[PDB]
């Protein structure tokens, strides 16, 4: 159960990487 | 437009003052070489091994075969003095040319003579200066061929009888050998060119290099770059600086490993034993000590189940046990007489270990390249007493530091050259920002 | 001493700067 | 012709026992009024079989195959000893000395590592009687000693050992000590194994012999910590004979 | 039932006297005349059923027999303990300084 | 296992070739200011 | 040890190796004369 | 519009969400190899005989590790510096036992980070930037080369490289100190000064800038909405900042050229981390930290201990215990 | 505590005569020991044979005794094994073997007494640390 927990949190972090790069609030100028 | 701290960048298009800087600087190198040798010799004591004595330059001369005899004993120190004095004397000629060209002499050459005048963007002039220097280098590699073959030879740690100066009669010319070294893996057991272990191959290699440098020297004088080269490179003073910095850095990292692993052209009689050598020597020291007491070294099971004194490598060769199982690729003239074709030979070990080999193993084990920065010999926990840092550690560490910083210099100047060559080394033109004309990424 | 000779050399350099700056030379 | 180190290094041939030509079908005769030695005995395993445990009771498990995970580090070699002629004409080899042990670990299906001390230590092996000649039908059978895989100074990952180390689970200071006794008190096993050497090649000119071997011995018991497995080793051998 | 055999041994004469059947060879340095020559011989020829048996080792100079005689009271003999003699541990038991 | 070795030797050669020829295809000219 | 006839110069040679370094120092003396220009 | 030329134009496009480039052509596969082998090994690799003594060390989660204690374990001392790709092993079971995954990961990873660095130069060139950000990154990259490659080369074994695990890291830095007295090595001391110093100036610059933001918002709104991406005027007043810090210390110990200030920010930690990378790299050749063991004694010759000897006692207990089964001889010479 | 003559008084021979060294000799001994010997014997141990140290008690039970200036000076001329049974100049530095151990070449007879004297005084100053090894560092 602890192995499932460590790997699940890691996988959630990798998923958040994906959204934060490809689905970010785009920076716009002035 | 340079500040005082980038002041030598003001020399870039001042061919005359730049010549004086290079030549003054070359005197500094010949000066250190001359003074340092005289410093070393003044301090030398011949009853002591060179490597108990902080010497780096004398070991280089001894290795060319001057001043030494069988087994590395120094016979004559006069060749050491002469080498020092001549380097030192010649630094002043170089000094002289360097200050004259740097101060009084013409600020720029191309007005005084079209031969010695150069422009960095002149691809033919530059490759022709390259070619002259290639031939000079070619000559230099052959001078060592000539020392080895016609003027007394070289110290051969592998000679029978403890090593000796030996004239090299049949240098290796076979390109499968000479150029096979360039194709060997750098990983353990292979060692790339660092594994060269006989003088025939070293002298062979230099016949080859000297010919190739002359070949190529002549090539670059007679040619100009082809379009594929013209479009691939930056053609500027800074960009050529950056290229040579790459090559010096590469070259220094090779030097570092050379002096750390190779005991042929860095003989251990002079420079001390290698790390691997000293680790092997200890297993030898205690194998001798215990077998004399009655131990059957080949049958002694150690705490792990592996042989206490002798185990097998992963491809099966019989090797020394303990942590030194890592060092089984070691090859040394004191050790090789025990090697049979399956690795170390238990009948030779039982029967044929000589006193000189006992001596060598004891010596090298107690002169392992481990020491503090303030020259306390041994592991970090040893007390004061032994004033000793192996010349190998000093030579390996100095050149790693230098190799590293020249690689940084290479990135620095190469990126700057690219940037200057395209017109934005001084920053981004506000009225014309590239990114402002590109579409957004999202 | 060695402090004698190393002082004779250590002074050589700054002496060259001095002499020029006094007698306005191309520094 | 024999090779040099530089020829062999890194090939794995160093881990291989000498072979005899398949013509070598001679016989080597034995003068009971002479004494002989084995100048070199080489044993080279090729197969490691482990005995399984079949849960029930009246089924008896089989020997199953394993994978070697410790590379070309398996051969015994440079073994020597007296080769004797007994009253009745049987021959007895007596191991004196040699590289007579190699640690090995093979891996069973399911990824269990099985470590063992492959060995012929203290090998005493003997033929039938009335030999009079070593032939391609001669069979040695003998037993040897299997000492403990670790010797007495070996420390487990908590610093526990037999001639050295802690005598308790110091990480569990007020834990019930009886349930850890088997893990706290290290024991040094010493068992016996059996071996058969089947000679299939004899070079009467040179006193060299070669053949096949099968030995049985126990695996590592981790200083009494768990029960050992039964191990069967198969391979080839070479031996050179000499007048004393 | 599970005992440490090394610890049990330290409660026999092995823990007070040089054990001719078990003690590492470096203990013969504690008495003069013994190390390395005789020590080599005693260890090679173990085991011994009695302390006196050391005198019957073949090759003993009559001077050697007297250095043993002088020292017999520092010797003893207990059952060979496998854990102390396997591994060549009588030649090197992994203790240096 | 040997098949594997082949596959990796080929993969690597292919990417290194890409790299070398990529930088020989006029790489100084690929900037936003001065192309030559 | 140096040869006998140069014995005299021994303390000079103990100081020579260091002189290349003294040139670096000297460039900073010089720049202090001209006001790091 | 030739096939090769369209390709070359995509590789170097500054329109790709992530820049690729020629250095990226090597970086993407080498880092995907390292990453995929790391994750799989951290989760499931079986135990590895790191020190050649047939004493395997469990590094992975399914074998009873947690996130802190798990590692990819370095390859076996038996291999030393030998190259151990998969195809040199008789099987993957052997390759796993002997630590092959670590060699695969560290080599791919070193290459790919080397190319990360070039990639950083490359995009700066395509965007019309100055080039030297990659020189800043060279200090960590140098540090990674030091503990994964150089230090093993010099000690003879990838088994003395740094494990890829949190506790493995601590093992390696504990044993480093017993064998090299790195605390007493000056290049590590500059590294501390490089890293303590950069943390300090990080906070200084970010506190001083934050202290001199210009009022653009109300107390109901984040001050950050005072700044709009790409606005042309500065968002703080650097003279108010100079005037505060110059009075906190004195005028000339404060900057008021922002270019010199940011170069100083860049250079202090980069240089200090170069040195500590050099320290690990030169201790690879056993040119160890200062040794002041028994340097102070009295008129009779008694040792008078200093803190250096206390450190040595500590170092000794580290020395005599590491790899406790691994040494048959009295000197741990490598 | 200071380097007083009581501490500087060492046996000269087995008959228990004594000899008192100057401070100069003591420091000469300490210099020569570092030059010619510490590489193996730093601390009074023996790096290449730890089973044998320079504690005075070990020297006392060496055959020929070596807990005195004579035995020690002799040992530097003609080393033997601990039981005195075989000469080991082939493999231990000595005047008899200075052909092969060149640092022994320029050691005068007084040098040998300072070395011997240093070895007998040092355990008096440092106690268990001399010959003790790392346990006592
Ligand atoms: C992310 C953003 C960017 C997008 C990226 C693009 C996405 C692409 C992502 C793909 C990555 C996929 C993940 C790869 C998993 C690695 C699989 C592996 O290691 O798989 C290996 C498997 C496993 O092997 C088995 O491995 C076992 C190892 O067991 C271990 O594992 C067991 C548990 O499994 C037990 O614990 C056991 O005890 C333990 O020892 C045994 O050794 C078996 O004998 C052995 O067969 O092998 C096999 O059968 C496999 C076949 C190889 C056989 C050899 C033939 C040669 C074929 C080579 C093909 C090369 C590939 C082509 C390259 C490209 C060319 C176009
Ligand atoms: C063959 C070697 C070589 C050459 C000829 C050059 C040449 C040049 N460099 Mg490059 N450089 C090199 C190697 C080299 N570099 C290396 C290896 C590095 C990495 C460190 C750099 C990093 C570098 C940077 C960052 C910059 C240059 C710049 C320059 C230009 C002006 C430099 C100047 O005036 O310095 C004048 C000299 C000084 C300011 C003194 C430096 C003092 C050093 C750092 C201290 C030495 C002390 C030493 C370590 C020992 C300590 C002991 C103690 C007694 C002091 C010039 C074209 C500049 C440039 O791009 O201009 C175009 C620039 O900004 N260089
Ligand atoms: C190897 C080191 C080296 C060398 C060879 C040079 C060489 C040079 N520099 Mg650079 N420079 C260096 C280090 C070096 N520099 C460092 C470390 C810095 C940072 C402090 C600088 C900063 C710097 C600046 C800011 C400038 C130069 C300039 C110059 C050139 C003009 C010198 C001049 O007119 O000064 C005049 C100096 C004097 C009149 C003083 C006397 C100096 C003499 C030569 C000392 C020699 C003493 C020696 C013992 C004599 C033996 C004589 C015997 C052999 C006959 C010259 C080619 C200038 C340049 O590029 O001009 C366009 C310039 O503006 N340099
Ligand atoms: C670059 C190659 C190099 C190498 C490997 C050595 C190596 C050695 N030298 Mg040598 N030397 C060199 C350059 C070199 N030197 C130069 C350039 C000079 C002129 C200053 C000298 C002058 C010199 C003298 C005068 C002496 C030595 C001595 C020695 C030995 C002991 C050094 C020591 O304890 O330093 C201690 C460590 C340091 C000083 C560390 C400094 C760290 C620097 C400042 C930082 C570098 C930053 C980057 C570039 C050792 C074998 C000694 C010896 O034993 O001679 C027989 C001795 O007396 N050397
Ligand atoms: C390192 C390269 C180098 C380069 C490219 C130059 C280039 C130049 N110098 Mg300079 N010079 C140099 C080194 C160099 N010099 C040195 C080392 C000194 C100090 C002695 C001088 C002193 C000097 C003076 C005093 C003058 C020049 C002048 C000139 C110009 C004309 C040269 C000419 O026609 O000579 C003719 C060519 C020859 C006589 C051929 C000489 C062949 C040599 C001797 C053989 C090679 C030596 C060998 C490689 C190594 C030495 C051996 C040793 C290892 C034992 C030209 C721009 C002149 C100038 O600019 O006027 C305004 C001028 O008046 N030079
Ligand atoms: C100081 C050394 C030196 C330098 C700086 C140059 C510089 C140059 N040469 Mg010359 N050359 C030299 C020595 C040198 N040469 C010698 C000795 C020879 C005789 C063999 C030649 C023969 C030669 C020919 C025949 C040609 C040049 C050309 C050129 C230009 C193109 C360089 C290029 O694209 O290479 C960059 C290299 C490549 C793109 C391919 C290199 C592949 C190598 C082998 C990979 C190895 C790297 C590896 C990681 C490191 C380990 C080594 C490995 C082999 C084991 C350039 C001006 C070209 C030119 O324009 O001619 C006029 C050309 O066609 N040169
Ligand atoms: C990691 C080190 C590194 C990095 C990042 C760079 C980066 C750079 N170099 Mg330099 N280079 C290096 C080392 C490095 N170099 C060395 C050691 C040398 C001397 C031999 C050179 C020689 C050199 C020249 C001659 C030129 C550059 C130039 C450049 C720039 C443009 C891109 C380019 O041509 O790269 C070229 C790439 C290399 C030379 C090799 C870098 C190695 C990378 C990191 C790995 C490549 C993987 C490899 C192909 C496969 C190996 C593994 C496989 C066999 C299993 C860029 C700033 C160019 C420029 O514009 O300068 C002004 C240029 O013309 N470099
Ligand atoms: C025995 C004798 C020995 C002699 C040895 C002599 C030692 C000196 C050698 C070093 C010389 C290097 C030049 C330094 C100047 C330079 O960098 O200019 C760059 C700027 C320019 O200044 C700026 O100068 C500008 C004018 S100009 O560009 O310079 O013309 C101006 O615009 C601006 O306001 C001003 O700030 O300087 C600064 O802002 C200060 C930065 C300090 C740089 C070094 C960083 C320290 C790293 C070590 C950290 C390790 C710890 C871990
Ligand atoms: C290694 C290269 C050594 C050097 C240098 C010196 N000694 Fe040594 N010593 C060494 C060994 C291996 C041994 C044991 C010899 C044996 O097998 O018995 C010794 C022994 C001694 C002893 C006797 C100690 C005892 O307890 O009886 C003495 C007194 C001794 N060595 C003195 C000595 C001196 C004065 C040295 C410098 C001139 C010296 N040794 C150097 C190894 C090495
Ligand atoms: C002497 C001797 C020898 C020999 C040696 C030799 C013979 C050598 C060779 C060498 C060689 C022959 C080398 C080569 C090298 C090369 C290199 C180093 C290259 C580089 C490259 C580069 C750098 C490039 C890059 C690029 C790209 C990729 C793209 C475009 C751009 C550029 C161009 C940059 C021996 C060992 C036997 C022994 C001892 C002695
Ligand atoms: C070989 C010989 C010779 C030669 C010599 C020479 C060549 C020398 C030179 C020398 C030199 C070349 C010198 C120089 C020196 C210098 C110095 C002495 C320096 C100092 C400096 C300083 C002190 C600094 C300071 C500062 C400043 C100024 C500013 C900034 C800050 C500072 C602080 C850095 C003779 C003749 C003797 C003869 C015999 C032998
Ligand atoms: Cl550890
Ligand atoms: Cl060991
Ligand atoms: Na003292």
């Amino acid at each position: 159960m602890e192995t499932i927990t460590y790997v699940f949190i890691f996988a959630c972090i990798i998923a958040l990487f994906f959204f934060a790069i490809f689905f970010r609030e785009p920076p716009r100028i002035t | 437009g340079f500040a005082w701290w980038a002041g030598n960048a003001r020399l870039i298009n001042l061919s005359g003052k730049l010549l004086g800087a290079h030549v003054a600087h070359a005197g500094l190198i010949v000066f250190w070489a001359g003074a340092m040798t005289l410093f070393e010799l003044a301090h030398f004591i011949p009853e002591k091994p060179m490597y108990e004595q902080g010497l780096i330059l004398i070991p280089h001369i001894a290795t060319l075969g001057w001043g030494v005899g069988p087994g590395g004993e120094v016979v004559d120190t006069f060749p050491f003095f002469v080498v020092g004095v001549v380097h030192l004397i010649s630094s002043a000629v170089l000094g002289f040319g360097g200050v004259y060209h740097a101060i009084r002499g013409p600020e720029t050459l191309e007005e005084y003579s079209s031969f010695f005048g150069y422009d960095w963007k002149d691809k033919n002039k530059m490759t022709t200066i390259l070619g002259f220097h290639l031939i000079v280098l070619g000559i230099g590699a052959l001078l060592l061929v000539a020392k080895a073959m016609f003027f007394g030879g070289l110290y051969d740690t592998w000679a029978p009888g403890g090593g000796d100066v030996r004239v090299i009669t049949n240098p290796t010319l076979d390109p499968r050998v000479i150029f096979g070294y360039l194709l060997k893996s750098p990983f353990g057991g292979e060692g790339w060119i660092v594994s060269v272990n006989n003088l025939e191959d070293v002298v062979g290699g230099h016949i080859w290099i000297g010919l190739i440098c002359i070949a190529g020297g002549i090539w670059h004088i007679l040619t100009t770059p082809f379009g594929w080269a013209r479009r691939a490179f930056i053609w500027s003073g800074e960009a050529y600086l950056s290229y040579s910095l790459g090559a010096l850095s590469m070259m220094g990292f090779i030097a570092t490993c050379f002096v750390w692993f190779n005991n042929t052209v860095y003989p251990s009689e002079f420079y001390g034993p290698t790390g691997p050598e000293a680790s092997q020597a200890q297993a030898m020291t205690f194998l001798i000590r215990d077998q004399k007491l009655g131990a059957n070294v080949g049958s002694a099971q150690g705490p792990t189940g592996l042989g206490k004194y002798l185990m097998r490598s992963p491809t099966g060769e019989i090797i020394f046990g303990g942590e030194t199982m890592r060092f089984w690729d070691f090859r040394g003239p004191w050790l090789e007489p025990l090697r049979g074709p399956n690795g170390l030979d238990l009948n030779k070990i039982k029967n044929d270990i000589q006193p000189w080999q006992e001596r060598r193993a004891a010596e090298y084990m107690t002169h392992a390249p481990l020491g503090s920065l303030n020259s306390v010999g041994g592991v970090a926990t040893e007390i004061n007493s032994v004033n000793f840092v192996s010349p190998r550690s000093w030579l390996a560490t100095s050149h790693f530091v230098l190799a590293f910083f020249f690689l940084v210099g290479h990135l620095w100047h190469a990126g700057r050259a690219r940037a200057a060559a395209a017109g934005f080394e001084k920053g981004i033109d506000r009225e014309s920002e590239p990114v402002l004309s590109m579409p957004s990424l999202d | 001493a060695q402090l004698t000779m190393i002082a004779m050399i250590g002074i050589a350099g700054p002496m060259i700067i001095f002499l020029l700056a006094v007698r306005r030379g191309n520094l | 012709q024999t090779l040099t180190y530089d020829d062999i290094v890194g090939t794995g041939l160093a881990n291989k026992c000498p072979t005899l030509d398949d013509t070598a079908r001679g016989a080597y005769p034995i003068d009971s009024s002479q004494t002989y030695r084995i100048a070199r005995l080489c044993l080279q395993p090729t197969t490691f079989l482990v005995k399984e445990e079949p849960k029930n009771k009246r089924q008896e498990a089989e020997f199953v195959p394993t994978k070697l995970v410790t590379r070309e580090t398996t051969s015994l070699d440079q073994i020597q000893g007296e080769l004797k002629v007994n009253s009745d004409g049987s021959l007895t080899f007596v191991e004196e000395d040699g590289i007579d042990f190699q640690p090995v670990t093979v891996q069973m299906a399911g990824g269990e590592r099985i470590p063992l001390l492959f060995t012929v230590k203290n090998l005493v092996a003997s033929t039938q009687p009335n030999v009079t000649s070593i032939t391609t039908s001669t069979d040695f059978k003998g037993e040897f000693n299997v000492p403990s895989y670790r010797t007495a100074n070996f420390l487990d990952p908590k610093g526990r050992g037999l001639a050295s180390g802690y005598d308790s689970a110091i990480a569990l200071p007020q834990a019930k000590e009886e349930e850890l006794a088997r893990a706290n008190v290290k024991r040094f096993s010493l068992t016996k194994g059996q071996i058969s050497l089947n000679v299939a090649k004899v070079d009467g000119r040179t006193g060299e012999i070669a053949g096949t071997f099968e030995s049985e011995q126990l695996s590592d018991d981790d200083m009494g910590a768990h029960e050992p497995h039964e191990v069967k080793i198969q391979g080839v051998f070479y031996a050179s004979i000499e007048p004393a | 039932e599970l005992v440490n055999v090394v610890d049990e041994k330290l409660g026999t004469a092995y823990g007070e006297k040089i054990d001719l059947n078990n003690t590492n060879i470096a203990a013969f340095i504690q008495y003069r005349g013994l190390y390395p020559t005789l020590a080599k011989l005693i260890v090679k020829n173990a085991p011994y059923e009695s302390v006196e048996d050391v005198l019957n080792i073949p090759g003993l100079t009559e001077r050697q027999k007297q250095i043993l005689r002088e020292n017999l009271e520092h010797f003893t003999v207990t059952e060979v303990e496998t854990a102390l003699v396997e591994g060549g541990d009588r030649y090197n038991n992994g203790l240096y300084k | 296992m040997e098949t594997l070795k082949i596959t990796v030797y080929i993969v690597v050669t292919f990417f290194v070739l890409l790299f070398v020829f990529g930088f020989l295809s006029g790489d100084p000219a690929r900037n936003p200011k001065r192309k030559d | 040890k140096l040869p006998e006839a140069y014995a005299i110069f021994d303390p000079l040679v103990d100081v020579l190796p260091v002189i290349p370094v003294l040139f670096l120092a000297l460039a900073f003396v010089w720049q202090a004369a001209v006001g790091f220009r | 519009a030739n096939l090769w030329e369209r390709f070359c134009n995509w590789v170097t496009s500054t329109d790709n969400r992530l820049y690729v480039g020629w250095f990226g052509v090597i970086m993407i596969p080498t880092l995907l190899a390292a990453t995929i082998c790391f994750v799989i090994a951290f989760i499931a690799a079986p135990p590895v005989d790191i020190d050649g003594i047939r004493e395997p060390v469990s590094g992975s989660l399914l074998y009873g590790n947690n996130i802190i204690t798990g590692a990819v374990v370095p390859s076996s001392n038996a291999i030393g510096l030998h190259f151990y790709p998969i195809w040199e092993a008789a099987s993957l079971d052997e390759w796993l036992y002997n630590g092959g995954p670590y060699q695969l990961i560290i080599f791919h990873f070193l290459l790919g980070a080397s190319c990360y660095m070039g990639r950083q130069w490359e995009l700066s060139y395509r965007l019309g930037m100055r080039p030297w950000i990659c020189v800043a990154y060279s200090a960590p990259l140098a540090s990674a080369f030091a503990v994964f490659l150089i230090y093993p080369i010099g000690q003879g074994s990838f088994s003395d490289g740094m494990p890829l695990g949190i506790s493995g890291t601590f093992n390696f830095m504990i044993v480093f100190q017993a064998e090299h007295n790195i605390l007493m090595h000056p290049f590590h001391q500059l590294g501390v000064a490089g890293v303590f110093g950069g943390a300090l100036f990080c906070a200084m610059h970010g506190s001083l800038v934050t202290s001199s933001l210009i009022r653009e918002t109300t107390e109901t709104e984040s001050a950050n909405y005072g700044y709009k991406f790409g606005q042309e005027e500065e968002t703080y007043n650097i003279v108010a900042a100079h005037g505060y810090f110059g009075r906190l210390i004195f005028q000339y110990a404060s900057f008021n050229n922002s270019r010199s200030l940011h170069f100083f920010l860049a250079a202090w930690p980069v240089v200090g981390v170069w040195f500590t990378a050099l320290g690990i790299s030169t201790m690879a050749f056993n040119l160890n930290g200062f040794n002041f063991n028994h340097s102070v004694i009295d008129a009779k010759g008694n040792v008078i201990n200093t803190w250096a000897d206390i450190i040595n006692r500590a170092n000794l207990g580290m020395e005599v215990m590491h790899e406790r089964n691994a040494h048959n001889f009295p000197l741990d010479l490598a | 505590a200071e380097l007083t003559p009581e501490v500087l008084t060492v046996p000269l021979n087995s008959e228990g005569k004594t000899i008192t060294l100057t401070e100069k000799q003591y420091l000469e001994g300490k210099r020569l020991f570092q030059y010619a010997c510490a590489s193996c014997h730093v601390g009074g141990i023996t790096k290449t044979n730890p089973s044998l140290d320079l504690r005075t008690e070990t020297l006392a039970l060496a055959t020929p005794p070596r807990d005195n200036i004579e035995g020690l000076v002799d040992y530097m001329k003609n080393p033997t094994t601990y039981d005195g049974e075989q000469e080991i100049a082939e493999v231990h530095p000595s005047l008899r073997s200075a052909d092969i151990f060149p640092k022994m070449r320029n050691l005068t007879e007084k040098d040998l007494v300072a070395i011997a004297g240093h070895i007998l005084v040092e355990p008096k100053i440092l106690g268990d640390k001399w010959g003790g090894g790392k346990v006592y560092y």
Side-chain angles (χ1 to χ4, degrees), chain B residues 106 199 328 349:
Chain B
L199 308 196
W328 75 278
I349 285 157

Side-chain angles (χ1 to χ4, degrees), chain D residues 89-131:
Chain D
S90 67
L91 301 141
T92 292
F93 173 63
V94 183
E95 205 236 351
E96 291 156 342
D97 183 25
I99 297 163
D100 54 1
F101 68 95
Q102 287 307 335
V104 192
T105 129
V106 290
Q107 174 180 305
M108 284 189 66
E112 190 189 332
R113 274 81 187 271
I114 305 284
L116 61 122
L117 193 79
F118 175 41
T119 192
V120 297
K121 265 169 182 308
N122 299 112
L123 179 73
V124 186
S126 275
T127 78
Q128 301 308 352
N130 295 94
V131 158

Side-chain angles (χ1 to χ4, degrees), chain D residues 119-123 143-147 190-193, chain E residues 86:
Chain D
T119 192
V120 297
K121 265 169 182 308
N122 299 112
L123 179 73
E143 85 200 314
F144 53 89
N145 293 323
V146 180
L190 180 78
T191 63
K192 284 198 143 178
Chain E
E86 282 303 330

